[PDB]
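Illustration 12: Putative Lipoprotein.
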Amino acid sequence: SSEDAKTIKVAASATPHAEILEQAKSILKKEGYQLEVTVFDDYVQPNEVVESGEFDANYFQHVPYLESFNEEKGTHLVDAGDIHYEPFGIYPGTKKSLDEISEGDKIAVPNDTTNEARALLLLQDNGIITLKDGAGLNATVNDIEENPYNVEIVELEAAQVARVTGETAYVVLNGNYALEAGYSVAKDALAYEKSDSEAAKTYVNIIAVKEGNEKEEKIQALVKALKSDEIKEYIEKTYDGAVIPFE
Ligand code: MET
Ligand SMILES: [Cl-]
Ligand SMILES: [Cl-]
Ligand SMILES: [Cl-]
Ligand SMILES: [Cl-]
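Figure caption equivalent — predicted structure in token form:
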């Protein structure tokens, strides 16, 4: 395990996660660690490859997603560090403005528990639907009380939502997939979560590890690098408010 002690294998999303990790590689190298990043296109395999012990950690999900994944998939993963937040947004599909919303419009949303709930909460915040009191972080389409435009919620894998912009009136995208598809939340989103919102302190992206590894020296070194002034400044200067360092 001496070679293992110096290497940090991290499963991550393409953007911003792998780009942020690439900047942190020089920080960790100076500290005697070899950061090795593998990029994943989905939200399932990064947790499975940490649970199996193939990777030391992953950098792709928020706290509600991890909790729901531990319950729904039987993983035992832990949040080793809170790093950044990505404003969730409603982006144009076949309609370019929310003022154009009309009866029966399809809205594409992520189909996992917490990101679907997040999409329904963002639609509620924009007066499109209302949800039952107490629906919360695991709100489903069955929690919809009011639906004045009789919108059709089209549930797809989060990675696929940006690819149905010619099939649905609007699409609700995770920051990482909006960036991957070339969107800018600040310029292109029709509506998005505010940086002083409840979502801003709830959907924080983390470093997740197997239970019992959250205090490993190398994990603590990785988390400290990602929360450093060099990484926070890189995030602020690069992503134009689409990625916000956690504080
Ligand atoms: C896999 S949970 C979603 C993570 C995504 N980067 C977000 O902050 O919306
Ligand atoms: Cl609009
Ligand atoms: Cl439609
Ligand atoms: Cl529906
Ligand atoms: Cl996905």
